[PDB]
């Protein structure tokens, strides 16, 4: 389920009330996160669980949850690069309902997108390194894209 802030604490535990707040009632067993817990590490743990519990049937969950896991691992260690949060948002958009074979992957990307929506300063703090995907090959001048 999507993370909610302290402002949403004054809301009745109904399906329609939590549905209009941008989350789900779910099993109605709420979990509280304090100020000590880093949101990036918590979302990394959640996505690690969700990626290793994929059944492997369909491409977006099976091949995109490990990408989000690796991005969150890099953000945890301060090895984040530009475009990582954009990749996480694209994964949120493209792992929604109707795009995967079952509802496991929309539930996987709900906490990631809610924590990005509410705690974006913690995810942006992990991006330190410049984006690098290639190494230099001697004798070939790279296409310097601007």
């Amino acid at each position: 389920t999507d993370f909610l802030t302290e402002a949403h604490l004054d809301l009745p535990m109904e399906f329609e009330s939590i549905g209009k707040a941008g989350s789900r009632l779910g099993t109605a067993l709420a979990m509280a996160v304090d100020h000590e817990i880093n949101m990036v590490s918590l979302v990394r743990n959640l996505e690690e669980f969700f990626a290793r519990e994929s059944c492997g049937w369909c491409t977006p969950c099976r091949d995109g949850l490990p990408w989000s896991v690796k991005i969150l691992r890099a953000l945890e260690r301060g090895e984040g690069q530009p475009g990582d949060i954009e990749t996480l948002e694209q994964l949120c958009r493209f792992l929604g309902p109707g795009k995967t074979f079952c509802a496991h992957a929309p539930g996987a990307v709900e906490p990631l997108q809610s924590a990005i929506k509410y705690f974006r300063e913690e995810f942006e703090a992990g991006i330190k390194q410049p984006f690098s995907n290639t190494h230099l090959i001697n004798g070939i001048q790279p296409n310097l894209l601007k």
Binding site: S54, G56, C58, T59, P60, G64
Partner: protein, 905 residues
């Protein structure tokens, strides 16, 4: 149904899903996990389109086109921006773990994943992390395994398990560690495992036989041909590079063999590339073997034959219709002999008489899958006519198809269909001397000698119709099984009876004809299928002639002093000692063949005939369809000393030199016209393919792709001067890329499927009228005969039951897909796949003889003692001994014969 794709209106079939409907309209939607023969599962998530609820809708919703019905009034968009982004994202997700392998991958240039990566427009990598890897498995001599390239599309497991009925392939593991393969290293046991190299959209499963002498798809010279390894007549695309047959691909034929071959047809082609093949005519003078060119061979052969008093010709079911006809015209009709034995010829002519005089429709191979109950009598279909066994498996799953259709479940929703019809299946009743590969899906399997299987068939026919002759002496348990079969057959709307000549029994074919007639008299839509032995067994049966025994009698009595043997080793149809004696007595033996056979030691002249890859001709398959095969390559392009001509060209030139002392070679259509003028029963072979003057808007049909490479260097080591391009006066195809291979070209013979953006076998979608259906302008091949107006009478001669006599062992035929066909044994890759030849014994008979499993026993047939190890066959009836037909030293003529003095060595 009416759909609107991107503002354009289209009329489609409402029973189709959106993906196949749009692919049939020429629209390009990327897809991985869907196949036309396997149905839709919605795994890869590549086929996304945007569906709108009404015409005035802007938001829409991303849906899977393969899982969405193409209902009337649908509104979708393929080129919607969000749909394009999602399809590109799916390709990008598949590319994150894909290895950097395209230069050293056999799928390169023939890869569906490459084509869909290019089609989505994804060429920029932003993934920077590690890629998962996998260890590979040893899958046997035919299939190479490379699990790094897997995209987890589940097509291999779906085809192999659900379609092919295989059991040793599966998916293991979990989330992104999904592994597709066997539970342990070993050979893939399915007879149709070779179709994985086309089913798999990546380079995981590849052709190992091709991978030995690998070349890319654009470098191949292709021709439309017919597989020569049994009588089914599956359409193939052989591809050649540098003068050798490199690969056999499946050529789509919507009526025969649509997407799938068997492993014998796919990997048994290696005899073409054998180094011991005759390449020039060779004349034996004393102990010398002089090499002649074509004109000297024709002149010398014509002079010696003109000196002779009576020359006889021995044809073969291996040779095409034109070559057998040319031999028949050279020696005369009264002197022409079919090269098969008298019993084999009698069974073949009975099968032909049932097919074209029984008044019962014989189905094509695709039509077999639409039947409701199957009775197989005598024929081990998986080992002799394997593609018919695959079609029978589809016909058996038809019951779950009907049960799901009763619940308004679409035909492409294959998972729901398999869930509804859990283990229910259409009735299958197979009879054999032992267990078969169809026993897992068979409702009943009857292991009995061929007389008892014939008696079971006659009893079934009598129980269906009391006018049929009755069987006296049926046990009550066997009677209950007979009543089960009769109740299943009478309740079927479309029963199918399958028999053939491989059982070695006339009575089995007679019983199958009686069952088909009894079902026809009850108003059922009964079909009958006869499986013949060789590629042109039915053509040789239609042409007719004497048996091999009569030809050997003519040679032994001295009434014939010259014999011309056409593409026949003569040891598979008669005893070797008799053949060698008759050929040694004959003062002139002339062997026209493409394989180094044992009778060429006694041959005074050897004509280097062409194989199917170097020849054109017509073959008649088991259903009576005449099919033309075309020459793949010129044998003389690289080796200019090679004089290897078509057999009909050799025999026509020999006849011309015998008559007028002048050499006229021929043209192929001239021989076709001679066939249809002299033999009216073969008049349909004229329309099997158009003549050599056929053009597509004035141009010929290309044999090789547009990007064929190395044209100024492939022969540059022999000479830097480029040779003359080989002319094809015989057919409409050209030995170059200067021709037409458009998917919209008005033709039925397609050498290979390529379309821009579709380099894989999925280009056959572009070549079809609708995807998974027929070819756009009809499938090639024409049936020689129609269903007869009236049928035959009931065969009264019911055989007695099998009685085990002391000192005589009835030979039970055991056929092997790798080893029973004559030319496929010569392929070096089959020796590692061919089983070691044992002899099958009942436990009671082995205990009576005091022999265990594996010990060597020696038996004499025709005064020749041979020794074999022993396996204990539980299902084999006592008094019988089981022998592998078609192996080295064991002729297929031994089926139904008896054995003497079989004892431990």
């Amino acid at each position: 149904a009416t759909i609107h794709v991107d503002g354009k209106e289209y009329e489609v079939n409402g029973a189709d899903n959106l993906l196949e409907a749009c692919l049939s309209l020429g629209l390009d939607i990327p897809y991985f996990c869907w196949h036309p023969a396997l149905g839709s599962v919605g795994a890869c998530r590549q086929c996304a389109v945007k569906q709108y609820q009404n015409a005035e809708d802007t938001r829409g919703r991303l849906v899977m086109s393969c899982m969405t019905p193409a209902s009337d009034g649908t509104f979708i968009s393929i080129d919607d921006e969000e749909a394009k982004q999602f399809r590109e994202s799916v390709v990008e997700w598949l590319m994150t773990n894909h290895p950097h392998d395209c230069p050293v991958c056999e799928e390169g240039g023939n890869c569906h994943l490459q084509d869909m990566t290019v089609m989505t427009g994804h060429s920029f990598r932003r993934y920077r992390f590690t890629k998962r890897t996998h260890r590979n498995q040893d899958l046997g001599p035919f299939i190479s395994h490379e699990m790094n390239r897997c995209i987890a599309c589940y097509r291999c497991v779906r085809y192999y398990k659900d379609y092919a009925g295989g059991t040793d392939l599966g998916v293991y593991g979990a989330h992104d560690n999904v592994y597709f393969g066997r539970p342990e290293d070993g050979t893939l046991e399915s007879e149709f495992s070779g179709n994985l190299v086309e089913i798999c959209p990546t380079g995981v499963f590849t052709d190992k036989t091709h991978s030995e002498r690998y070349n890319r798809k654009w470098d191949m010279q292709f021709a439309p041909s017919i597989c020569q390894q049994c009588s089914i007549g599956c359409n193939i695309s052989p591809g050649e590079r540098y003068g050798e047959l490199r690969r056999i691909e499946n050529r789509y034929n919507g009526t025969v063999n649509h997407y799938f071959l068997c492993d014998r047809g796919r990997f048994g082609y290696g005899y073409v590339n054998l180094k011991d093949r005759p390449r020039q005519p060779v004349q034996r003078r004393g102990d010398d073997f002089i090499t002649l060119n074509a004109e000297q061979a024709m002149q010398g052969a014509a002079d010696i034959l003109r000196q002779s008093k009576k020359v006889i010709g021995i044809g073969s079911p291996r040779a095409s219709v034109e070559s057998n006809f040319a031999l028949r015209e050279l020696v005369g009709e009264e002197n022409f002999y079919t090269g098969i034995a008298h019993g084999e010829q009698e069974r073949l002519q009975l099968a032909l008489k049932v097919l074209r005089e029984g008044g019962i429709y014989t189905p094509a191979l695709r039509e077999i899958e639409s039947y409701d109950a199957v009775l197989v009598l005598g024929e081990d279909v998986t080992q002799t006519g394997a593609r018919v066994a695959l079609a029978v498996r589809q016909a058996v799953k038809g019951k779950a198809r009907e049960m799901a259709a009763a619940q308004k479940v679409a035909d492409w929703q294959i998972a729901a269909i398999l869930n509804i019809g859990q283990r229910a299946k259409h009735p299958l009743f197979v009879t054999n001397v032992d267990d078969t590969r169809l026993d897992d899906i068979a409702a009943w399997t009857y292991r009995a000698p061929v007389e008892d299987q014939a008696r079971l068939g006659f009893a079934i026919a009598h129980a269906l119709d009391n006018s049929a002759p009755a069987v006296d002496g049926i046990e009550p348990e066997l009677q209950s099984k007979i009543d089960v079969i009769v109740q299943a057959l009478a309740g079927a709307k479309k029963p199918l009876i399958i028999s053939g000549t491989n059982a070695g029994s006339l009575e089995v074919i007679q019983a199958a004809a009686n069952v088909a007639k009894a079902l026809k008299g009850r108003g059922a839509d009964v079909g009958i299928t006869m499986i013949a032995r060789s590629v042109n067994s039915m053509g040789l049966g239609i042409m007719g002639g004497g048996s091999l025994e009569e030809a050997l009698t003519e040679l032994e009595t001295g009434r014939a002093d010259a014999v011309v043997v056409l593409e026949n080793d003569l040891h598979r149809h008669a005893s070797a000692t008799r053949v060698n004696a008759a050929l040694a007595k004959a003062p002139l033996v002339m062997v026209v063949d493409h394989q180094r056979t044992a009778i060429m030691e006694n041959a005074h002249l050897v004509l280097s005939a062409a194989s199917f890859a170097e020849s054109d001709g017509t073959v008649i398959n088991n259903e009576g369809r005449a099919q033309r095969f075309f020459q793949v390559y010129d044998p003389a392009y690289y080796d200019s000393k090679t004089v290897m001509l078509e057999s009909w060209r050799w025999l026509h030139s020999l006849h011309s030199t015998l008559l007028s002392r002048e050499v006229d070679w021929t043209q192929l259509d001239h021989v076709i016209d001679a066939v249809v003028a002299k033999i009216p029963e073969l008049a349909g072979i004229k329309d099997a393919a158009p003549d050599a003057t056929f053009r597509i808007r004035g141009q010929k049909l290309a044999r090789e792709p547009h990007r064929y490479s190395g044209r100024t260097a492939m022969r540059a080591n022999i000479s830097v001067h480029e040779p003359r391009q080989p002319q094809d006066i015989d057919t409409m195809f050209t030995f170059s890329m200067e021709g037409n291979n458009q998917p919209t070209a008005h033709r039925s013979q397609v050498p290979f499927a390529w379309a821009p953006g579709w380099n894989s076998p999925q280009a056959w979608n572009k070549f079809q009228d609708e995807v998974g259906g027929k070819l756009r302008f009809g499938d090639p091949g024409v049936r020689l005969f129609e269903t007869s107006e009236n049928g035959l009478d009931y065969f009264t001669s019911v055989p007695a039951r099998f009685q085990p006599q002391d000192g005589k062992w009835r030979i039970a035929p055991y056929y092997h897909l790798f080893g029973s066909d004559e030319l496929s044994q010569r392929a070096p890759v089959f020796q590692s796949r061919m089983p070691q030849p044992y002899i099958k014994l009942n436990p009671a008979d082995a205990a009576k003889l005091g022999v265990n499993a594996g010990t060597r026993v020696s038996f004499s047939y025709d005064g020749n003692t041979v020794t074999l190890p022993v396996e204990i066959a539980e299902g084999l009836t006592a008094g019988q001994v089981g022998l592998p037909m078609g192996m080295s030293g064991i002729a297929p003529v031994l089926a139904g014969a008896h054995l003497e003095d079989l004892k431990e060595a």
